[PDB]
Amino acid sequence: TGTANTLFGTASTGTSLFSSQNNAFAQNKPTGFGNFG
Amino acid sequence: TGTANTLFGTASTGTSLFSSQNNAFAQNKPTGFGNFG
Amino acid sequence: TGTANTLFGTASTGTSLFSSQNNAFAQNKPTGFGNFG
Amino acid sequence: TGTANTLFGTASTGTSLFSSQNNAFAQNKPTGFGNFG
Amino acid sequence: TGTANTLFGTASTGTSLFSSQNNAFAQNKPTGFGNFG
Amino acid sequence: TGTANTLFGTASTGTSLFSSQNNAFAQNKPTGFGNFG
Amino acid sequence: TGTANTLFGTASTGTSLFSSQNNAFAQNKPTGFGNFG
Amino acid sequence: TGTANTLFGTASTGTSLFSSQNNAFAQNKPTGFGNFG
Amino acid sequence: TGTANTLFGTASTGTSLFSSQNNAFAQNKPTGFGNFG
Amino acid sequence: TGTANTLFGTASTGTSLFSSQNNAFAQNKPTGFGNFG
Amino acid sequence: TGTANTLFGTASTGTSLFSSQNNAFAQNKPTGFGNFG
Amino acid sequence: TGTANTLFGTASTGTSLFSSQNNAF
Amino acid sequence: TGTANTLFGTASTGTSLFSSQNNAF
Amino acid sequence: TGTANTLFGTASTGTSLFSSQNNAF
Amino acid sequence: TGTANTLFGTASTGTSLFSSQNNAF
Amino acid sequence: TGTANTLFGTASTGTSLFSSQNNAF
Amino acid sequence: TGTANTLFGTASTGTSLFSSQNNAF
Amino acid sequence: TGTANTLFGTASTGTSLFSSQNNAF
Amino acid sequence: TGTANTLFGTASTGTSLFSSQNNAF
Amino acid sequence: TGTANTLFGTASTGTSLFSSQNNAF
Amino acid sequence: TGTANTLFGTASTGTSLFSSQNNAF
Amino acid sequence: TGTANTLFGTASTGTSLFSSQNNAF
């Protein structure tokens, strides 16, 4: 499987089975810059 | 499988089976810049 | 499979089977800039 | 499969089978700029 | 398959089989600019 | 298949089989600008 | 499986079975720069 | 399995079974720089 | 299993069974630099 | 199992069974530099 | 099992059974440099 | 199966969406 | 199965989405 | 099964999403 | 099973998400 | 099973997420 | 089982997340 | 089982996370 | 079992995390 | 069992973590 | 069993961690 | 059993950790 790439939060490469992944984010003025390629 | 690329939140490359992925985001004035290519 | 690219939220490349992906976003004045190509 | 590109929300490249993807967005004055090409 | 490109919401390139994709958007004065080409 | 391009909502390039795609939008004064070509 | 790469949060390469992964993030003005490639 | 790489938080390579991984982050003005490749 | 690499927090290579891993981080202006490759 | 590598916090290579691992970090202006490869 | 490598905190190679490992860190301006490879 | 109940006050822009799929193999 | 109840006040922009899928193998 | 109850005050932008999936093997 | 109750004050941007999955093997 | 109760004051950006999974082997 | 109660003051950005999993072997 | 109670003052960025897992062998 | 009570003052960035696991062999 | 009580003053970055595990053999 | 009480003053970066494990053989 | 009481002054970086394990053979 391919690489899992994240800045904030989680990067999950393993297979997930009956298994919950969750993330609650509360941001006051976030700024995100992505240069994907 | 291809690379999973994320700035905030989760990048999941593994196969997910009976398995919940969730993310609750509450942003006050987010700004997102993406240069996809 | 191709690369999954996201700025906020989730990038999921694995095959998902009986498995729920959800994201609740509540933004006050978001601004999104995308340059897709 | 092709690349999945998203700014906010989810980019899903894997095949999804019996599997729900959902996103609830509540925006106060969002602004979106897209330059697709 | 071709690239899935979205600013807000979801970009889904994988084949979807018995599988629901939904997005509820509630915007107060959204503004969208698209330059498609 | 061709690229799926969307600003708000979903861009779906994969073949969809027995599978529901839905989006509920409630906008107070949206403004949309499209320059398609 | 591929490498799991994260800046803040968790990088999970092992297969996860009946097992919950969660992350609660509360950011005041985060700034994220990603150069993915 | 692949290497688990994280700056803050946890890098988990072992298989996780009935086992919870969680991280609560509260950041005042975080800045993240990632050069993934 | 692959190497678990972390700067702050925990690097866990062993299989975890009925066993909880948690980390509470409270940062005032963190700065993270990652050069992943 | 692979090597567990950490700068601050814990590096755990043994299998963990019914056993809790936790770390509470409170940083005033941390700076993290990682060169992962 | 692999070597457990840590600078501050604990390096645990033995299997841990019903046994809690915890570390409370309170840093004023920590600086971490990691060259993992 | 599922019963969605939605109330909107006066002068309020609103949508209701309901999707049900029954699969019987 | 699931009953979603949503109330919106007056002059309030709102959406309700309900999805149910029943799978019987 | 699950009952989501959501109240929105007046002049408030809001969404409710409900997803249920029943699997019977 | 699970009952989510969410209140939003006036003039407040809000979302509710509910997901339930029942698996019966 | 689980009852999440969330209150948001006026003029406050907010999300509620609820996930339940029932597994019956 | 678990009851999460969360209060947010006015003008406050907030999220609630609830996850329950029931396993019955 | 577990009851998490969280209060946030006005103008305060906040998250609540609740996870419960019940295992019945 | 466990009751976590967390108070945050005004203008304060905050998280609450609750995890419970019940194992019944 | 365990009751964690945490107070944060105004303008203070804070986290609360609670973990409970019950094992019944 | 154990009651942790933690107070943080204003403008103070803080964490609370609570872990309880009950083993009943 | 054990009651940890921790006070932090203003502008002070702080952690509280509590661990309890009950073993009943």
Residue numbers in the entry:
A (entry chain K), B (entry chain I), C (entry chain G), D (entry chain E), E (entry chain C), F (entry chain A), ...: 85 to 121
L (entry chain B), M (entry chain D), N (entry chain F), O (entry chain H), P (entry chain J), Q (entry chain L), ...: 85 to 109
Authors' text:
The human nucleoporin Nup98 forms fusion proteins in certain types of malignant leukaemia, is a critical component of the permeability barrier of the nuclear pore complex and is mislocalized in cytosolic deposits in Alzheimer’s disease. Key to these Nup98 activities is its large FG-repeat domain with a high number of FG motifs. The most aggregation-prone segment comprises residues 85–124 (named Nup98FG85). All four fibril types display a parallel in-register β-structure comprising short and kinked β-strands.
